[PDB]
A paper describes a structure:
A recent study showed that A. baumannii upregulates production of an outer membrane lipoprotein, which we designate BonA, in response to challenge with polymyxins. Analyses through X-ray crystallography, small-angle X-ray scattering, electron microscopy, and multiangle light scattering demonstrate that BonA has a dual BON (Bacterial OsmY and Nodulation) domain architecture and forms a decamer via an unusual oligomerization mechanism. BonA from A. baumannii is a member of a diverse family of dual-BON domain outer membrane lipoproteins. We demonstrate that BonA is anchored to the outer membrane where it plays a role in maintaining membrane structure and is required for twitching motility.
High-quality crystals were only obtained for N-terminally truncated BonA, missing the 27 amino acids (aa) after its lipid-anchoring cystine. The crystal structure of BonA-27N consists of two α/β-sandwich BON domains that interact extensively via the external face of their three-strand β-sheets. In contrast to the structure of DolP in which both domains adopt a canonical BON domain fold, in the BonA structure, α-helix 1 (αH1) of BON domain 1 (BON1) does not adopt the expected BON domain conformation of running parallel to the BON domain β-sheet. Rather, it is displaced from the rest of the domain. The 39 aa of the C-terminal extension of BonA-27N (aa 196 to 235) are disordered in the crystal structure. Analysis of BonA-27N crystallographic symmetry reveals that it exists as a dimer, aligned with the crystallographic 2-fold axis. The interface is stabilized by αH1 of BON domain 2 (BON2), which substitutes for the displaced αH1 of BON1, thus completing the α/β-sandwich fold of BON1. This interaction of αH1 of BON2 with BON1 is largely mediated by hydrophobic interactions, with Tyr118 and Met122 of αH1 of BON2 extending deeply into a hydrophobic pocket created by the displacement of αH1 of BON1. The interface also contains two symmetrical, highly solvated pockets, which trap a total of 34 water molecules, as well as two Zn2+ ions which were present at a high concentration in the crystallization solution.
Numbering used by the authors:
A (entry chain A), B (entry chain A): 9 to 151
Write the structure that this text describes.
């Protein structure tokens, strides 16, 4: 029961964001040990109707208030660029920024993905971009 | 500068979720004092491209780990019911559950809103539902 021991004290030191879009979950945030990072993934994967989980939680101290506000501003800037985009729609992707990493998740076609990649290069205050896009034009695997 | 004093210590005691959909922001979570709750709203409202902010942060202790996992499961259950719904689409609303309160936000027409209300009555483990829906069929105000 090591991953449950003193869970309350460890979670008080944590920030855990759980964001779902369709049946895919993005985990971001900060926890004090790898046991809690894995527990969060295990617990989310066990939820009904969850298909895939992307666990980008880090093991380390919680980020500062100014960081989450800067992160939110990056996300707001990205959403504004998306609703202005020619092809890709703002409704079709989830956008989250955690500690300067811009995450974009959703289901798009190839034309929409190319537009999205063009938009994301225009976002400031981003150290890394992680796209989690399922291309709906990909042929399904054979039986 | 009372709302900034010892901000780092106060934010360590906090959970602040900032979720945007189109140009509307939902704030949920827990902070130790009303000054931080108001500061979060002021800082989010100041971001470029933010039109409306719904501040549902509470002043109190951070919720437990088991609570955020139960909350996520409510959200996952709601998303599953939405993608099965006849009229309303899962892509058109943002769903978030915080401490047993189900928040649904987005832009819908009347038919989609009626379907949504039918779906939300079928979600368990919810003490309160807060819909933040803009009905796109509402006539715009006169000049
Ligand atoms: Zn879906
Ligand atoms: Zn894994
Ligand atoms: Zn992944
Ligand atoms: Zn987010
Ligand atoms: Zn929009
Ligand atoms: Zn206010
Ligand atoms: Zn409101
Ligand atoms: Zn949420």
């Amino acid at each position: 029961n090591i991953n449950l021991y003193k869970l309350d004290q460890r979670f008080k030191q944590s920030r855990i964001n759980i964001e779902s879009f369709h049946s895919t979950v993005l985990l971001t945030g900060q926890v004090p040990d790898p046991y809690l990072k894995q527990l969060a993934e295990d617990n989310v994967k066990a939820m009904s109707d969850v298909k895939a989980v992307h666990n980008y939680i880090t093991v380390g101290n919680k980020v500062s208030y100014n960081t989450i506000m800067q992160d939110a501003g990056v996300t707001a800037n990205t959403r504004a660029l998306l609703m202005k985009a020619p092809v890709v729609s703002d409704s079709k992707v989830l956008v989250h920024t955690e500690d300067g990493v811009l995450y974009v998740m959703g289901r798009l076609n190839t034309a929409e993905i190319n537009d999205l990649n063009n938009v994301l290069q225009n976002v400031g205050n981003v150290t890394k971009i992680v796209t989690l896009i399922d291309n709906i034009d990909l042929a399904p695997a054979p039986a």
